[PDB]
């Protein structure tokens, strides 16, 4: 019963936030809210970043599951090859994607699919490694990498750019975007007569909607009892910026990826840096609340653990040895949720009729920015097809019984889902405001 002019709100202007903010206003709402506190592009948004990589990779081997990610990640690439706003940030470079150990490389195999595409490149040999860049970029010996490249139909984009535009265009036409603290900040979201009414802000004001979207990322488990379907996950990213002198030869080289060791992509324009990660199967903050349960929980930080920086540079010896030994010149902790197959969780909730729910990304859910608004959409609208709807629907039973130490076939470091609380030691970078 929504017409175009209901009051909708949505509650985060991060990644999914934002898309779905744009495909409102494409559809026609015209009354649309969006609370964040931080400004536009958020320091505490996953999709705040210089990079991220866009591919077709799969993350399950059961048919039903392939066949659904097929089809988000096709509306997905379509959105960064033929929608006008988003293709300026787009660039198909390429992407190795590569192993080392026989378990790694049977994920490699669910990842990739080597059989399916005829157009790869099998790599065995560190000469073939070193080829994928001009003399001199890529020096290492990259022991026991084996892999695939794609020469195109795979890249990055310009996340944080990406972002941004869609925002802009969300605001031209129409939406209201109330970013910063206290004033977008939700402290809750209001409870009345067993429904979702709308939210609160820290600034003491009421916000009532008569659909409110849940798109709060890595916090998003903080408003509503999600049924331990969410776990607040971390990563790490560092930044290294090149000489003004030695940047040309880096240009365009394709994302270098090994799902055991990290990755890192061509610099960026502005400053030169190569962002780069180290890969590992993330850290939670696990804290005991009054009660005895457990939970993590997502907080800001510009730097990373020490253990992480000594990856990176272990990574860094392997591929480009030359840089391996270079200050960082930015680094930061970054936060998803995953689900417990890291399928997304996309639906109106069950016995809150004025609530619909957009997030476990499961970190991986950047590339979607062109499309996933469609789909959350969709989910207010009652549109969403069954095929879909069945592998991304409200489920606390796969949640049941979980296990919060579920690697979720990720690999790298320690093997194991660690937790920030054993942290002692952080890096010592300067600060830089990434919300600018
Ligand atoms: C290091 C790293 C690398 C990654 N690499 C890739 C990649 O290469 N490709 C890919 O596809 N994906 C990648 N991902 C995953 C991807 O970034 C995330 O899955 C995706 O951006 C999550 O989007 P989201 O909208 O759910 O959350 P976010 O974009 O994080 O947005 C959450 C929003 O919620 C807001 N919020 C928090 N508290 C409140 C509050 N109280 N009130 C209102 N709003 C609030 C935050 O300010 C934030 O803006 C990566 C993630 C990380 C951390
Ligand atoms: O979706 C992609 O193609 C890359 S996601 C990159 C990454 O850093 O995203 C965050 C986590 O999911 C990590 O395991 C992962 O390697």
Redesign the pocket.
Known sequence: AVTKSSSLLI?????????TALHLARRGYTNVTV????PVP????????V????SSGQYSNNKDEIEVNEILAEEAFNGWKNDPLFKPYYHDTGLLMSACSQEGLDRLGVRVRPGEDPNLVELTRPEQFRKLAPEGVLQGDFPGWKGYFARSGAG?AH?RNALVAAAREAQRMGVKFVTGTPQ????TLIFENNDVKG?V?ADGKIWRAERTFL??????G??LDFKNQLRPT????VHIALKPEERALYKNIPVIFNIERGFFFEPDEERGEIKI?DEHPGYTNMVQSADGTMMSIPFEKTQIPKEAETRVRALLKETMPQLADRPFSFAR?????DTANREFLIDRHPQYHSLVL??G????????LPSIGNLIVDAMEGKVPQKIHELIKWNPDIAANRNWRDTLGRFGGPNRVMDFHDVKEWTNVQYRDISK
């Not at 990079?51 to 866009?54: G, R």
């Not at 971390?234 to 990213?237: F, R």
């Not at 902790?333 to 949720?337: E, K, R």
């Not at 990304?361 to 979607?368: D, L, N, T, V």
Request: aromatic content about 14%; overall charge positive; proline content about 2%.
């Open positions: 509650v985060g202007a991060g990644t999914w936030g934002t898309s609370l964040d506190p931080y958020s320091a505490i948004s996953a999709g705040n970043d990079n991220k990589v866009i990055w996340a977008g900040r939700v402290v939210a802000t798109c709060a990322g890595a916090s998003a903080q408003f971390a990563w790490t990213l990660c902790i970054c936060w998803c949720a957009g997030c990304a499961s970190g991986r859910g950047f590339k979607y």
